[PDB]
Amino acid sequence: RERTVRLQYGSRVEAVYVLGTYLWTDVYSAAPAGAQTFSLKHSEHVWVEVVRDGEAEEVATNGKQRWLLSPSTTLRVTMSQASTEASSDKVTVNYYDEEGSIPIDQAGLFLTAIEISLDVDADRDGVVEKNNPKKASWTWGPEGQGAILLVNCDRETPWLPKEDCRDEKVYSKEDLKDMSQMILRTKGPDRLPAGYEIVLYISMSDSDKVGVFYVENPAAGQRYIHILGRRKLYHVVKYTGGSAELLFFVEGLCFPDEGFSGLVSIHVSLLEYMAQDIPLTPIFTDTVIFRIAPWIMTPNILPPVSVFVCCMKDTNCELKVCFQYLNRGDRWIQDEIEFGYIEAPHKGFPVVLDSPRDGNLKDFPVKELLGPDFGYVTREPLFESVTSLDSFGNLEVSPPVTVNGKTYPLGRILIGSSFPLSGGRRMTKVVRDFLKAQQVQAPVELYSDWLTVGHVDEFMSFVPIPGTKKFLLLMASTSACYKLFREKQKDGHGEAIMFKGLGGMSSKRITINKILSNESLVQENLYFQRCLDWNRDILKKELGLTEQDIIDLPALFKMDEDHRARAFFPNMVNMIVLDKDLGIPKPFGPQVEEECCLEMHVRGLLEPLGLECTFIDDHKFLGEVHCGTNVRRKPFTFKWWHMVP
Amino acid sequence: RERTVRLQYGSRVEAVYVLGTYLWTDVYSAAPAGAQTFSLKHSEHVWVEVVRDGEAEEVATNGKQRWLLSPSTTLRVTMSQASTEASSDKVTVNYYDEEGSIPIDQAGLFLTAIEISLDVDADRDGVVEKNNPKKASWTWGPEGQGAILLVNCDRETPWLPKEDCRDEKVYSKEDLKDMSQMILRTKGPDRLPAGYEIVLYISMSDSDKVGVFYVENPAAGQRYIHILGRRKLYHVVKYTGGSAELLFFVEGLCFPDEGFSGLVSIHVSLLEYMAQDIPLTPIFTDTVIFRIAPWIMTPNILPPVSVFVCCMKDTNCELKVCFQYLNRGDRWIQDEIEFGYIEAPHKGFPVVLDSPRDGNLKDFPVKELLGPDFGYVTREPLFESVTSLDSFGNLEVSPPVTVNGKTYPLGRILIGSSFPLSGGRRMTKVVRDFLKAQQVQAPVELYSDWLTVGHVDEFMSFVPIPGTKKFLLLMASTSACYKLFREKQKDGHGEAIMFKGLGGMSSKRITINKILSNESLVQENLYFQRCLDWNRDILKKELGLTEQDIIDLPALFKMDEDHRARAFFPNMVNMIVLDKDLGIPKPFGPQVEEECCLEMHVRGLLEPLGLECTFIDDHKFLGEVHCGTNVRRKPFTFKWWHMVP
Ligand SMILES: [Ca+2]
Ligand SMILES: [Ca+2]
Ligand SMILES: [Ca+2]
Ligand SMILES: [Ca+2]
Ligand SMILES: [Ca+2]
Ligand SMILES: [Ca+2]
Ligand SMILES: [Ca+2]
Ligand SMILES: [Ca+2]
Ligand SMILES: [Ca+2]
Ligand SMILES: [Ca+2]
């Protein structure tokens, strides 16, 4: 960082030297007309080199030595340490005419050495290191370095219906715990030389991205000032003498999205005062880079924490019930809500994603899932209309996977869609852009649009098989149901009847025979099986799965007027997964040996593994038990900043 | 690329096999109830493996061999070559009950092998290679591969006031020369099996990005069809038997900009017909990636081609004069216009950038610089108002440079600006975003706003010093002018007078003495010298320049009511550079030895090098000779796709 300084004719120039920089000094222009030579004298803590076209001769404090004047011959001035006083560090050059040994005129430089560094934590250990070279850049990888910033999606004070990032005001003292520290460190004399001031500033573009607070009068009357943020581009810092540190707290307002990479910057600058109606000059500038931590989903293979359910009709973790007024006739806590988390070094908390769907429970998250160490976010489309695929039963995430040499440690977000040439339903562009812009989990689009509801959770699920790993992707199969039913028919059970209890029940008698003897049905389910196999191909491709990794659960579908599938009997891939111990819907299949053959079948599949199956009663609404419940999960041990997406 | 195929119970399934893929075939679901075993028979060109949980046993054409039925035991079907007929490649599986050696039922797969590849040139040699693996990706670097696409910024037919990319219609046959070739290559039987069709498609987002034409009835009535583009998302391709190729031409509509990376994609897909009111199924998809070639500026160190001038008052390359009606009272051909070029492998041409400034000559480029092999582009701000910094005298470009290990082969675009905290003038966001999004030349912002006009060309220029390299950045210096004037004063010439001819002339006598004796002036020019030194620091930093690379030309400025600089005498860094041989403005300085001391000074500087100086008369307008002329230049020999920005 080389800065240009020129002496003035017959005059003494006062200047501020910022450590970490070197001065190129021009002694030629200040030379009087007729002077053929120059000698120089300088202070102890000032290093002076005489540079003629690249060759630098370091010179003593008292020169008593002359050089030939020339534009090529110049000075290089460096300073080792900060100044105790505004002066006493100087470089004085005397000029000589060839006819005498006495100087004619002389020029000088009065140096005031200060050290200004804007510091953040770029090595991600949870404390702030002094002047990290990499602080102005952001690098992915375990050996990579950069500062990380959390959004405040949460609420310290219940008195308001908003996240803490929503205002420019800070109320509670615990707020700052979520903010990332930025310290301005300074070394210099008792005060600054006249016409100099230090200023913090951010872009107009970064106004809504960040905010920066300073805490004044700690204990006592303690107050939180908003120095940077919305409507504040700059703040003028008060300089304090000697070694001094100014502690600031930074908060991300916005999440990484379309048009926003997640990267933000804050600058500090030393401004020299020129004159009225003229801009201050940025003598020196230091810069730090924050990256706003993304939003990360939790798959079904992670340890569960909380289980949520709407209300109602009628193990080793808690259950949060959504009652009455909160329900407002909306039975789906799955579709409206996706659980996630955000993390920084030694900082982080759960964050919830609220669906644009805006069911009668739309009011519920904020009022409230939202509170201390619990986050909230939304994307509401303006020009686009909401469909059934924007429900979060259509939003899932895969276990950590490896696809052809590339690692996906946090898994891959799976969302349902339609063929591009179909012209069918799709998730809103805002949500897709959001998830895509999170970019750590690298979203994929399956095909859910052959289903009436259009959700991913209908045809697939993941369960842990406590190696602990490998997660055994479970898919629906109509083929398996027809196979099982044909086997039971050949066993003499073809007259056995589905839907014991309920209705008809046996008044309308639906038997394995009459089901297998249904033509339109078997055609429909052949087509549906194709629809399943396409998704199977996508999953195997993009998730790097073999055929060894898949289990086909018996399922049956029925085609509606839209040529879409609705569950013939309750969908069993619609289950919920807690640490093995499956929540599978009760299929209500036909009875063999006084037992439902479907239950015994899926047991015969999963039970040889650690999985313990449990069957829940529900289906005309229509959805099974995924649509009725949502489970909060414990995050990955893997830190997202160690990736290379 | 593994695709899922299932046999149907007691039935023969017909299917299309696309080469480069392998089929996972399920024989378990199609098995009749009670069958304990299965044997298989298959054609010669069909390879069949029996896979039980990862162990694959390749089997002969006539098996006469039974395996135990099981969900784990499955088939792997591959095909080596395309089919001569829709059938005669098949796999038939017979099922056996344990009580007999005669098959009970059987299932089958009738394979039709076709080969579909969408091909482009990803290795950039100028011809289209067969199925480049890297065609679906775009990589920077000499060893990197990807397809390159030119925008059509030019006009084949003069009858219309628009570039060729502006419509969906193609008229002239030479148009296609600028387009990039994309060939669909096919191998198969005389026709396609029933319920199958091939479709080309692009995104709705890519509608305005690209266009794709097919040429039908060559010679003869030869017609150009627009298959893909604005308002056309898809086109249904006619399948031709045997080895067949369909040639398409692609044209970029839009340049890389804000919100557009420059990358576009075109897909081909094999669709299977399902049924009415149901979407066709994408059995197979191939994808190619084009990147639209950026727009690249030419520095002053490149060989010149054409020289442009407005009109009027009053070597070894031509001169294009802009007359009268075209002028419309606008004397600046520099501010309105920036010359550039675009290139693909074995394709390319000059492209002009038209300023949002919209001077009276705003009409001129299109009407016309625009024609065959000459391009045109514009960025017109909507919400933002134009200033003097949007003129292209404020838009320049550096020679190829190396900054701390990083190479900038095409140079770096230099544009003037103001301090962020000033609140002063700046270039419109649209143009800045454009240049930034070109991204190969990595734009930098100097500080031009201390100048009244606010242009970069005022304080700096580059000239070749025929090593050939190193380009000697020339900067304005008030200090050098004051030094020279003081020397001349001490020589007894202090009574010599500037502006011979003109006015006053000597009636108002402006002498070296009276100039040096001016206080306010010397203060103003000290400040201006600081303004020069800041830019000097920026250039040295970002261009990786030493102090050896700079020459300070004598200059003098005067502060207006805006506290900005206007030339005291004509600005000499405002010159034009053709292959040495400088176009420097005539300074009209004071006379020594019957010669202008400034001319002799800058000669004394530059003439020791290959540069041959020539002085042009002009200044009250105000600008010198850069503002009055613009030179078109020969491009780099360096291909932009070999970079790593
Ligand atoms: Ca707040
Ligand atoms: Ca908070
Ligand atoms: Ca909502
Ligand atoms: Ca908190
Ligand atoms: Ca979900
Ligand atoms: Ca056209
Ligand atoms: Ca054209
Ligand atoms: Ca224009
Ligand atoms: Ca052309
Ligand atoms: Ca220019």
UniProtKB/Swiss-Prot annotation, chains A, B:
Residues that hold Ca(2+) 4 according to the record: D164, D167, K169
Keywords for the protein's UniProt record, in alphabetical order: Calcium, Cytoplasm, Hydrolase, Metal-binding
E.C. designation(s): 3.5.3.15
Disulfide bonds: none
Active site: C627 (nucleophile)
Signal peptide start-end: none
Pfam families (alphabetical): PAD, PAD_M, PAD_N
Record-level Gene Ontology MF annotations: calcium ion binding; histone arginine deiminase activity; histone H3R26 arginine deiminase activity; nuclear estrogen receptor binding; protein homodimerization activity; protein-arginine deiminase activity
Cofactor field: Ca(2+)
Residues at which Ca(2+) 3 binds: D154, E156, D178, D373
Record's subcellular location: Cytoplasm
Binding site for Ca(2+) 1: D121, D123, D125, V127, E129
Outcome following mutation: Q334A: Strongly reduced enzyme activity
Coiled coil region boundaries: none
Sequence positions that bind Ca(2+) 2: N152, D154, E156, D164, D175, D178
Outcome recorded upon mutating W332A: Loss of enzyme activity
Phenotype when changing D164A: Reduced enzyme activity
Effect of E396A: Strongly reduced enzyme activity
Effect of D167A: Mildly reduced enzyme activity
UniProt key word Metal-binding: yes
Quaternary structure note: Homodimer.
Protein purpose: Catalyzes the deimination of arginine residues of proteins.
Protein name: Protein-arginine deiminase type-2
Organism from which the protein derives: Homo sapiens (Human)
Gene: PADI2
